[PDB]
CSV table of C-alpha atoms and ligand atoms in Angstrom, one decimal:
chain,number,residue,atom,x,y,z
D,1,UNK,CA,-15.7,-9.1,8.8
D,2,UNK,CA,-13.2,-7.7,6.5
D,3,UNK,CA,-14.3,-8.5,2.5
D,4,UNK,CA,-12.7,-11.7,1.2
D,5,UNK,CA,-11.7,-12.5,-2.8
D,6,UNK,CA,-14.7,-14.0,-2.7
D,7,UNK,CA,-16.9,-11.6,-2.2
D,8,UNK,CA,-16.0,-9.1,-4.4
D,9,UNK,CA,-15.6,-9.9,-8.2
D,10,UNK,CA,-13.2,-7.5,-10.6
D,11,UNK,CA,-13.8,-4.4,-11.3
D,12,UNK,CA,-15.7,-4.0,-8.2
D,13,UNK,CA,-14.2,-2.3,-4.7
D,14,UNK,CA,-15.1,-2.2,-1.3
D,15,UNK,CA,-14.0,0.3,1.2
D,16,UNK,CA,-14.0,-1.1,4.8
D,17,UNK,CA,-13.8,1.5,7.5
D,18,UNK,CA,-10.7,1.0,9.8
D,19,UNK,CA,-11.7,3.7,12.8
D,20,UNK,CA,-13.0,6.7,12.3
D,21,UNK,CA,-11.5,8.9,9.1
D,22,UNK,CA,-9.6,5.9,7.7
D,23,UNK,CA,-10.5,2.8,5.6
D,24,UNK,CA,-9.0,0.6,3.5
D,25,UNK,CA,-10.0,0.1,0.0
D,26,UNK,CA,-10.0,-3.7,-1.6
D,27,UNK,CA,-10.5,-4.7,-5.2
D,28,UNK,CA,-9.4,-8.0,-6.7
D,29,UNK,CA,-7.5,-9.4,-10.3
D,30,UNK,CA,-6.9,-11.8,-12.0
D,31,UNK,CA,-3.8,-13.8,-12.9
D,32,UNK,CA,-2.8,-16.7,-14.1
D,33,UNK,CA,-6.7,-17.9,-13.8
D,34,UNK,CA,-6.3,-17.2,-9.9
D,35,UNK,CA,-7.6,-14.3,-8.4
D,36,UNK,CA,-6.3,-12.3,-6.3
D,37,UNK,CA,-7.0,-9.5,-4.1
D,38,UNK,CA,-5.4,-6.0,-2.9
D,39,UNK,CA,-5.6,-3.2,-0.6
D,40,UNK,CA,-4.7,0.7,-0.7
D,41,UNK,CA,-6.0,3.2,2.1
D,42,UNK,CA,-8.1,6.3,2.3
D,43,UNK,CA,-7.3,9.3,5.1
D,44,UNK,CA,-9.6,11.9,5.8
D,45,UNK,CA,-7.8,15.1,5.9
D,46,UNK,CA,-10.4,17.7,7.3
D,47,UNK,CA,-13.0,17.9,4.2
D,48,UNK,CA,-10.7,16.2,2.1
D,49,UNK,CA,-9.3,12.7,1.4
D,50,UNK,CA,-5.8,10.9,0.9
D,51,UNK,CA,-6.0,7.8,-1.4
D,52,UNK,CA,-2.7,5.5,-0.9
D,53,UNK,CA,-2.2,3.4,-3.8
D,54,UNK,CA,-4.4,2.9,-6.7
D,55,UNK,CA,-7.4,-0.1,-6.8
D,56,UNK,CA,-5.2,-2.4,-9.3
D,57,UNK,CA,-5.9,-1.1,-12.6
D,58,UNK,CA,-7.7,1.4,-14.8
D,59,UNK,CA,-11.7,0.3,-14.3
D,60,UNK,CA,-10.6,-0.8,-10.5
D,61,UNK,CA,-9.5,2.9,-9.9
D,62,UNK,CA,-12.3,3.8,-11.4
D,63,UNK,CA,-14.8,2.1,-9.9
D,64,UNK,CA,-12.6,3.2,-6.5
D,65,UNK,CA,-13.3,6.9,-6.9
D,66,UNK,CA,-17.4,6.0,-7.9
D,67,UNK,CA,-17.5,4.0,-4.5
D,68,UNK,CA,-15.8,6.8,-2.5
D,69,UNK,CA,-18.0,9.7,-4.1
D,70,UNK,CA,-21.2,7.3,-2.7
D,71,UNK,CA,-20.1,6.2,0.7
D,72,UNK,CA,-17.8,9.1,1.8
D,73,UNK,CA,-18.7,12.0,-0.5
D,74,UNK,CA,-15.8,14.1,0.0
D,75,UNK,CA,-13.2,14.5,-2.4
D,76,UNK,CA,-10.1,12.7,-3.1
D,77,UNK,CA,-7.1,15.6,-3.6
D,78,UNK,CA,-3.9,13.9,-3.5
D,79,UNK,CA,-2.9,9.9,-3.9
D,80,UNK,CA,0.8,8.3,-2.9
D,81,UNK,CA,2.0,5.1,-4.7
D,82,UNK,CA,3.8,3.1,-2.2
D,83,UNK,CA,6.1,1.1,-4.7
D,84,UNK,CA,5.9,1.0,-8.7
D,85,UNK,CA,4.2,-2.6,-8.9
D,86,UNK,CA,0.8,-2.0,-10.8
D,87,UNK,CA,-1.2,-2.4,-7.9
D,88,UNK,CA,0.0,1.0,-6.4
D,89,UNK,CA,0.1,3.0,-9.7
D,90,UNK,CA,-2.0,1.2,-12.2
D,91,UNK,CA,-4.6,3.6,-11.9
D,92,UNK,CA,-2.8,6.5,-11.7
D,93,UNK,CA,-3.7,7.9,-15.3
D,94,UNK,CA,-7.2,7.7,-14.2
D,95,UNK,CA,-6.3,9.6,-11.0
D,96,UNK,CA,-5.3,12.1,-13.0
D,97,UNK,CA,-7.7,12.8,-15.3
D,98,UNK,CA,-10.1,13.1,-12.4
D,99,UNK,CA,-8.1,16.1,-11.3
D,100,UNK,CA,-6.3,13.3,-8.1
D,101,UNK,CA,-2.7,15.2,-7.5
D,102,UNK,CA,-0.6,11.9,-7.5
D,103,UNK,CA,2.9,11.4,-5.5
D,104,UNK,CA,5.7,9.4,-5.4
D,105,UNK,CA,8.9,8.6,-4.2
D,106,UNK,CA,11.0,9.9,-7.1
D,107,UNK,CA,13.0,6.0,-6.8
D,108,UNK,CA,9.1,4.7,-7.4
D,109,UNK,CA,8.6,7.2,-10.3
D,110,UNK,CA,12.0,5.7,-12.0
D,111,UNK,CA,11.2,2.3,-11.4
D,112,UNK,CA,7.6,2.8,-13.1
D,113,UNK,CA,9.0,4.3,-16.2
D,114,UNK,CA,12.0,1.5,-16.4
D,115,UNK,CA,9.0,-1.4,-16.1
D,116,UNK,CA,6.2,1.1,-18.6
D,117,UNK,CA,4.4,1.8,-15.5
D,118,UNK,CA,2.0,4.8,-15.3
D,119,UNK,CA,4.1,7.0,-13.2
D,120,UNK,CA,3.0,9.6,-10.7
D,121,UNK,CA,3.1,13.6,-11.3
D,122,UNK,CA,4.9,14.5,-8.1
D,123,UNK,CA,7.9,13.2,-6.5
D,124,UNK,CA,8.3,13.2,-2.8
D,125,UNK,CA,11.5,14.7,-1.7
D,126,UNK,CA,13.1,13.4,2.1
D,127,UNK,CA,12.3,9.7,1.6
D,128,UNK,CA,15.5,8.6,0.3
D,129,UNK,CA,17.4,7.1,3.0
D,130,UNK,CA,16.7,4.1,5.0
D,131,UNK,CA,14.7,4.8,8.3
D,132,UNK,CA,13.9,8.5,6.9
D,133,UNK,CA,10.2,9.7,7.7
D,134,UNK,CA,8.3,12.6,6.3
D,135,UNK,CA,4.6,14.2,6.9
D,136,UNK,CA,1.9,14.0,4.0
D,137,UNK,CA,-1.2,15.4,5.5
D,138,UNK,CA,-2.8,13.4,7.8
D,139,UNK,CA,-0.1,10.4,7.6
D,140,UNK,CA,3.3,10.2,7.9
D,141,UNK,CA,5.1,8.6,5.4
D,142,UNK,CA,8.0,6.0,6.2
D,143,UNK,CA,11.0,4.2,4.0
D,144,UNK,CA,12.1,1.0,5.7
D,145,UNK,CA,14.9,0.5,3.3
D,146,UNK,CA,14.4,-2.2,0.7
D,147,UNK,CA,12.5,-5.2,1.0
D,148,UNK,CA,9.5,-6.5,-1.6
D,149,UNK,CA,10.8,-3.6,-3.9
D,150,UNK,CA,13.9,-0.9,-3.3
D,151,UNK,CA,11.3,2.0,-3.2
D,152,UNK,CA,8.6,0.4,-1.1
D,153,UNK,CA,7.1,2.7,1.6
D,154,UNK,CA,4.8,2.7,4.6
D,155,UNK,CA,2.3,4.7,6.0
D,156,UNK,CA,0.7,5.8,9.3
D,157,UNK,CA,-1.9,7.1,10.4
D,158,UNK,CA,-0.9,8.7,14.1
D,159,UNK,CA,-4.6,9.5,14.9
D,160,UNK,CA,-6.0,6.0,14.3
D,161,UNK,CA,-2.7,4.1,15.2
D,162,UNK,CA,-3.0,2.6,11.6
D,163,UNK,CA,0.1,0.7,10.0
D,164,UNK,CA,-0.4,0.1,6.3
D,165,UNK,CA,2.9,-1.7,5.4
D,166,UNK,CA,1.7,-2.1,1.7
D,167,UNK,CA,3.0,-4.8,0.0
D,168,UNK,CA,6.3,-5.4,2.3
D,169,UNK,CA,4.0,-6.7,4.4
D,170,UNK,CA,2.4,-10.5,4.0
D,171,UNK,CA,-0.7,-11.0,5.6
D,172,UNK,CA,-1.0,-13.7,8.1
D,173,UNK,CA,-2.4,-16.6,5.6
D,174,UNK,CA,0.2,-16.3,3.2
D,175,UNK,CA,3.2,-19.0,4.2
D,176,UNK,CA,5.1,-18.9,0.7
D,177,UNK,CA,6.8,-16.2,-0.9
D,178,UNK,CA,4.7,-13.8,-3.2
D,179,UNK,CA,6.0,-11.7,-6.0
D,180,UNK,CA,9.7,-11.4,-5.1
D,181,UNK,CA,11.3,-10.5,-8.5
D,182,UNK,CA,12.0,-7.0,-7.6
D,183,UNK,CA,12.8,-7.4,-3.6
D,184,UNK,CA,16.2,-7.2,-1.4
D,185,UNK,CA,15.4,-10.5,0.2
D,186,UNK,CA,18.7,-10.0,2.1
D,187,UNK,CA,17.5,-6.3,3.4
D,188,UNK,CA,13.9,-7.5,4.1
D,189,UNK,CA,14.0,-8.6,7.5
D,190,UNK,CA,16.0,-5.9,8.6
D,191,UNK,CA,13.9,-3.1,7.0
D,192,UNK,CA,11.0,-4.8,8.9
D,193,UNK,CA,12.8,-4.1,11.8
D,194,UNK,CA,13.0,-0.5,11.0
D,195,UNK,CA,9.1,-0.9,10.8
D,196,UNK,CA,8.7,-1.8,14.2
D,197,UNK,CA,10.9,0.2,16.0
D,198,UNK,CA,9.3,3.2,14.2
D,199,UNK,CA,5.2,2.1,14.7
D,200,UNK,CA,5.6,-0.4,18.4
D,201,UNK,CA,2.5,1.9,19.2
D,202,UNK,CA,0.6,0.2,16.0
D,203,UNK,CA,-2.8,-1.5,16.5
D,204,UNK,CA,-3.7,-2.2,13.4
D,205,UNK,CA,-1.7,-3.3,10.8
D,206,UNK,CA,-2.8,-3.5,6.5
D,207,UNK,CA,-0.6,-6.0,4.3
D,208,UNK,CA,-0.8,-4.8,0.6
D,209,UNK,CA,-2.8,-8.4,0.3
D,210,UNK,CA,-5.4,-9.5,2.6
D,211,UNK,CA,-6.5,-9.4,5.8
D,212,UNK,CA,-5.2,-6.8,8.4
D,213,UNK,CA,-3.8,-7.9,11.7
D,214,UNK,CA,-1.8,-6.5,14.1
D,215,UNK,CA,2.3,-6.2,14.7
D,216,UNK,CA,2.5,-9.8,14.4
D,217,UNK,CA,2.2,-9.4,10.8
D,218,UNK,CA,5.7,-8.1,10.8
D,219,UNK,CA,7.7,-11.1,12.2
D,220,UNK,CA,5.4,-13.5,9.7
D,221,UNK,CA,6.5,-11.3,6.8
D,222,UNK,CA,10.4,-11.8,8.1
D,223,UNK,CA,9.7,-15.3,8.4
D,224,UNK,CA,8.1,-15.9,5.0
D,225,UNK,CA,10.9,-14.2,3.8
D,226,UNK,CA,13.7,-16.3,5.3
D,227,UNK,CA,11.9,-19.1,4.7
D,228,UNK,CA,12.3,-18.3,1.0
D,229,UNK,CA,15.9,-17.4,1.4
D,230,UNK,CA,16.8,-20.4,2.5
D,231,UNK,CA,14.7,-22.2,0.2
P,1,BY0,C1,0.5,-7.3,-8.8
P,1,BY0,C2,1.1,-7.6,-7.5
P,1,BY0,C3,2.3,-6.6,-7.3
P,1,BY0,S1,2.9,-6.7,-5.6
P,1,BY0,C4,1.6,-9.0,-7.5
P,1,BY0,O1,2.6,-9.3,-8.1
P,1,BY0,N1,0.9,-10.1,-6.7
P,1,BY0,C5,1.3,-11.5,-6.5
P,1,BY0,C6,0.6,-12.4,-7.6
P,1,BY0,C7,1.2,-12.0,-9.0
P,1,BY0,C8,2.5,-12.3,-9.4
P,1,BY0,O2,2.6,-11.8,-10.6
P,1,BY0,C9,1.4,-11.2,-11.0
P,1,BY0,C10,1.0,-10.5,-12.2
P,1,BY0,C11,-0.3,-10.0,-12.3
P,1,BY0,C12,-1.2,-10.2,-11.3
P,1,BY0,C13,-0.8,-10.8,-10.1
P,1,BY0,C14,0.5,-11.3,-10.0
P,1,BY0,B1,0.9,-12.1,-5.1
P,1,BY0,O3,0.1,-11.5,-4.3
P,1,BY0,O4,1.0,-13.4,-5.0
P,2,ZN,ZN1,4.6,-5.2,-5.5
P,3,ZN,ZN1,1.3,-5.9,-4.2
């Protein structure tokens, strides 16, 4: 069973294994007096590992890297930030210190400093353009185009068949809009199109919230979305 907000109280993470050489990683915040949980993804990369996105937070990521070093025991050499929200690179300074190279999309590093963000070392070149794809390792990393933010990307995993649509994607429980300040609602749909024609091959599919599914995921997000649209 994959961990709940329930089960897992801040500061805390759990890594849930996914197929063999990639989990995903879950810690929760809170906000507003709700809580709320998130997920990023670790790759095995021979006898290394690729984090994508942070835990949520300083003592989250921290607590991440602790909980990798005692279930996987190999080290973490490189993390991507998926979009400049704080649950993909608040973190990132403790990353760092830790000796994690940390990657972005040079549109995410420009939106992190424009909101005060920590902001990744190293930007990754070949992203720019709707529909472009580039390798990272053992993922390949995908822009859609815009949808919850400008810069969001997506990653898969080709050995495992793993789509981790970050925070573009809702999971299947959430029927209402989530944080849309910085989305293209009008691109949205369409970018998750991009998303499918790229991955069909996808069986298993990580929202940037919640439980993982498969493809389905996708035409729920569009219709969340155009739900809210019309709203
Ligand atoms: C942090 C994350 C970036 S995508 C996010 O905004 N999550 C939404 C809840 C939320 C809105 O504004 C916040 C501010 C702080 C914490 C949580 C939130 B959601 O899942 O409904
Ligand atoms: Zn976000
Ligand atoms: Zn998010």
């Amino acid at each position: 069973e994959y961990p709940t907000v329930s089960e897992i109280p801040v500061g805390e993470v759990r890594l849930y294994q996914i197929a063999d050489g990639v989990w995903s990683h879950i810690a929760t915040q809170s906000f507003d007096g709700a809580v709320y949980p998130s997920n990023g993804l670790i790759v095995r990369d021979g006898d290394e590992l690729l984090l994508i996105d942070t835990a949520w937070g300083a003592k989250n990521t921290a607590a991440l890297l602790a909980e990798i070093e005692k279930q996987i025991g190999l080290p973490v050499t490189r993390a991507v930030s998926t979009h400049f929200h704080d649950d993909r690179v608040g973190g990132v300074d403790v990353l760092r210190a830790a000796g994690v190279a940390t990657y972005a999309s040079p549109s995410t590093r420009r939106l992190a400093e424009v909101e005060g963000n920590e902001i990744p070392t190293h930007s990754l070149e070949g992203l720019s353009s709707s529909g472009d794809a580039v390798r990272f390792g053992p993922v390949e990393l995908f822009y859609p185009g815009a949808a919850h933010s400008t810069d969001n990307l997506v990653v898969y995993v080709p050995s495992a068949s793993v789509l981790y649509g970050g925070c573009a994607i809702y999971e299947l429980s959430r029927t209402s809009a989530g944080n849309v300040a910085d989305a293209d609602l009008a691109e949205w749909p369409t970018s998750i199109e991009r998303i499918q024609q790229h991955y069909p091959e996808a069986q298993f599919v990580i929202p940037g919230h919640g439980l993982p599914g498969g493809l389905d995921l996708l035409k729920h997000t569009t219709n969340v979305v155009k739900a809210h649209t019309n709203r």
